[model samples]
Target chain A: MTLFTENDLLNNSYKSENQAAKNILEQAYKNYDKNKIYDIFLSHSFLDARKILGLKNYIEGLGYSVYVDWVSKETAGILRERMQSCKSLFFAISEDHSLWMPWELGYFDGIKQKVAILPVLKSSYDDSYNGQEYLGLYPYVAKEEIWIHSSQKQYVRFRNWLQQ
Target chain B: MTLFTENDLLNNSYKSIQKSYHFSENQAAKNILEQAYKNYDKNKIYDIFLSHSFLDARKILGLKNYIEGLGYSVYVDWSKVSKETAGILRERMQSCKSLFFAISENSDHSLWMPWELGYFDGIKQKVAILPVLKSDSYNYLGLYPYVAKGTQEEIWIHSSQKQYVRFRNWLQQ
Candidate 1:
């Protein structure tokens, strides 16, 4: 799916104090589309790995590349470099508190990247993940209505969204 | 008025958010609330008004008690709903600081609940219209734009006392 708005790709021009750093970003944009690494970035807590993979495999089966933390050895900066060119972000919020999950979410949100959260509800957890209350503060974005395990609704809806 | 499932109410709840109110800020709402508070018999002002279906009385009442137990005043109709006039209910809804719908399958079926929610949604942005999930069948936590504007509160009241206590603490925050 083509996630970047026409303006997003065109507006990424940056002037850096260091010539080396400036060249790096400009170089990435030069080969942006042909060299784009992934189609989507998965923002998930480690606790929800099994569920995240379920989504990754489903999307990848549709012939799209997905970026998950487990498969990458790159630093946060490298992940973010890919995010600038990715279409959308998928957040798997299942644990009570995972420090890194919120940070990555904040970073993605700060850049106005579109994000959808899969609120994986566990029957054992009384339908709320840890620190679920914090999600109430973020502005409206996309979300999966039912829990991930309820059905394949998320994949179906996302498939249609991409086709749009 | 009636919908097929809890999901219907959850979906309809956002209609109110999309429908903004005349009052621009909560400050204006508080001024009107203060004016309404004087006309009532009591000296205290209500922070929130609870709306629910009769079939879900026990859970609604439990929320009333829990909220009241936290030292905040809440208005819940016990037997007075049948006796109360439309004017009286409208006045209370307008005067309260916020409105909370104890959303459940039964409450979703109530004709008055949707009207009440929609009425408040059009004119009261100062107060919050919270949908608290009381059953496992429905979850609309991320549905509404206003409620979802931030990580807004969604109360899950079932078999867990710890969650109940947690919700109470969250209410205080």
Candidate 2:
């Protein structure tokens, strides 16, 4: 249901940016069994692999399976099928600026997946500047009083939310 | 507001990479570089790095398409990067001689847009970095390091027919 350690993630980021994103998604994609529905769908850019991996582990730690893009070999039709079957979706916002991020996010949105959008903020760069939400995603995450942060307290907060 | 014509920007790419500056005085060499980029063949060694927020891609793509139409090479993300990693992005930006950071209201909130501009300005300061402002927000321009220094490296594109022609002329000169 889950992934690995904090040290594992930090070490993971050092991988070629291209390979690391592909690798983690590769791992997550394999976690979903054919017939069983996954609990959350994770959509993110390769840029925030560290934060995302951490979040992925935490969610997996909670006993929920996640859906993520598989290796490049998989077809979009199958990818969409897996994603749509999930109960909810989570998008990681970092510099989350790449063309692919929006393309994927837009796809999930266009289908109007029954899953609600869960935005996990990486960290507030400061109290004033916890980076802005990626465009087209603000309306979903902006109002929630609870947010996901990198610290333990935040993780605890996130766990509490997941319990609901 | 967009500054410079399609041609002016085209010329900027062509002229900025000229090597003649090595042989002449600063002011005179600048003129020659301006006129020098016209020969289509020379552009093979010179490419312009175009940085813009993803939200502003449509307008930026318009420029990317037009400038490249004239046989000049432009390295905007769509053309240059497939999956952007920080390492790959830095190498691409470093490889180019000039940079054009497109600034729009949509751009202000983007993390990569400013980081790319800052990378070119601070880390690669000698590179010819220009902030192409597409809005009337003078305040927004001031937020950048090199652009805030002065107007010499800046281009404000006001939406008008003559300006584009002039901008185009400025680029291809």
Candidate 3:
């Protein structure tokens, strides 16, 4: 039995940014596959190494190159480069006591970047990471990412956005 | 028949930025009342404003003062200043329009200061006019300002912000 994974969405390595991956796959038999998979950036705090790897492994398994931690030495340090590199960025915000929250979050503040924060409400999630007050936060880009066992259809909505 | 005329929120006898006025009311009461007055700066063109409430405009109208909201100068020099003010802000901050805005704040202090739509230095477009209301006054802060008529301190909303907060929190979005 095949794992009913979110990976089912991937057709042929989100082949290229120039073409719409989803749109391409929509008509694959006609030979309209999207040229490539766009790179995905993962940003998180140092404390959640396990979580970061989980997401990275998942995204890579789906065929996209994952910029773990913004290409920074640590997975927590991805905001700067990721903002400029990938078309989309997922910020895994968990409430762990870490000073890095402020700087990492400053990146998401005031509707500033394309960086969408996926706030996972972990049983261990620190309430401090509850940035509901991150008002003016448009796209609430990462709200859907909050669920621990996110649905493939939900992520597919975002994945499909890459095509546009 | 009655004609409604627009007047400044305060009586002229009172100074615009008067801390001394507090002596008549006491710090707590004065601060609370002031905060309860006008907190969100609406209009000012940009959909949002980064506020810096280091001063006072206790009444509310327009002046580009510190109490109301951060104007073009404040946002650039302070809020999203530096080359680092994210790229999408380019919708306005970089559009050369300087007229685009929405919501936001700066500095450690978080106060609610709203603005009326107005132009900056003859420019066609208006800046969001961000204002940082004194965090000290957050407790008393609300969405509108009180305009006393015939000795009646009537409260009023800045039209836009009355609906904006739903979209912007920290009143900064």
Candidate 4:
């Protein structure tokens, strides 16, 4: 029931320093293959580079191919193509705002129907995260697991959620 | 057909602006309806009411600037409050001479674009599709005329060979 916090992600060596950001991005794209399908399309605000890298690293640890646009950006056509190849989307939620997140969520939800929230909390908490407005409709991540916000037992491991 | 490509939009300062709204389907609809109700401006009249997906914010902003440079005032919803309602949007549409539905890759995801188009068309009968193309291969299946560029860089509304007209002229008509 633990939520990911900004400090927790930063402490995991996902610092926002230039060299660290560059290294994380380079490593993430080292095995880039345009034709390969990805398990999760990580929709995030560019401002949260550290959090994105941390979440990317954590998700990859669970054995999932995550697509972060910073590695290689694309137009709407190419974006749609990449999104079509991904099985699901993990919208990284924080205090910061992003223009593409809602669009990506809408398009991904319409196409794949497997979208979830990955709330990066300000501090560690054992309580569930309640997303505002329309975000409240989707499942969310907590302690490396995905849970349907309204369901008591509909939780699954991140890997299992991706596969399912 | 001279389509307005992504580069064209960018060249027109589309990438110069970067901001957008982040709301879910129902919340977005509610905001639109609510904003329309709270901020209905009866005295203000706009030349063109730009109906578009918030995802295309930059492109639409560029288009708005482009249209304004052509000596016309454009109304984009983002310039107002975050929330808007259908009733107030309709009232605002009534204040405008025309509505240009900026069609883009994310148009399908919009909660208000279609409603805006229908309401504007029914009320003003001066609605047109402004295709913000990502590529040159563009095809609009809708019945309305689409915005395109002419040889002299003039904006033209193409319904058919016999129905086409200059954008400025169309607005006056």
| TM-score of chain B as predicted in candidate 2 | 0.45
Error of 2 at A128 (Å): 8.4
Return whichever of 1 and 3 wins on lDDT.
1
Mind giving the per-residue lDDT tens digits that candidate 2 earns over B1-173? Answer: 33333344334433433425423433443443334334324324345676655432234444555456655576664333222354455566666655666555444434455445444543333222234443222322333222221022333232222232222233343
Write down the worst ten-residue block by lDDT for model 3 chain B: B112-121
TM-score of each: 0.29, 0.33, 0.37, 0.49
* lDDT for each residue of candidate 1 in A33-135, tens digit (9 for 90 to 100): 6366465676656433334445555456556677655312235445556566666666655525454454455445445334555443432313322222334
Per-model C-alpha lDDT, please? Answer: 0.42, 0.44, 0.33, 0.63
Give one digit per residue, the lDDT tens place, for model 4 in A21-135. 7677767656567788888888766435666787777777767788876512225546666677788877777753554555466457556767777777788657477666435
TM of chain B vs. native, candidate 3: 0.19
| Residue B16 displacement (Å), model 4 | 43
Model 3, position B99, has a per-residue lDDT of 30
Clashes of each: 10, 17, 46, 9
Model 4 CA deviation exceeding 4 Å by range: A14-16, A26-31, A71-74, A144-154, A159-164, B1-173
How many angstroms is residue A146 displaced in model 3 relative to the true structure, after the best TM-score fit? 12
Native contact fraction of candidate 4? 0.00
List of clashing residue pairs for candidate 4: B31-B84, B32-B84, B32-B85, B33-B84, B33-B85, B35-B83, B35-B84, B36-B84, B36-B85
Candidate 2 local lDDT, A1-164, one digit each (tens): 11122343455345425466657767766666778766667776543555566556655655767676441313544655776666556664443254445434434543432223344443333322233333332223222132433322333233344454
In order, what DockQ does each candidate have? 0.01, 0.03, 0.02, 0.01
User: In CAPRI terms, where does candidate 4 land?
Assistant: incorrect
CA shift at A39, candidate 1, in angstroms?
2.9
For candidate 1, lDDT tens digit of each residue in B1-173?
A: 11123333333433322324433332333343344345454444576676665432223444555455546567763222221343466567656655665554334434354335434543352223344443322231222211210133333232122222233333354
DockQ of predicted model 1: 0.01
TM-score of chain A for the candidates in order shown: 0.49, 0.53, 0.44, 0.79
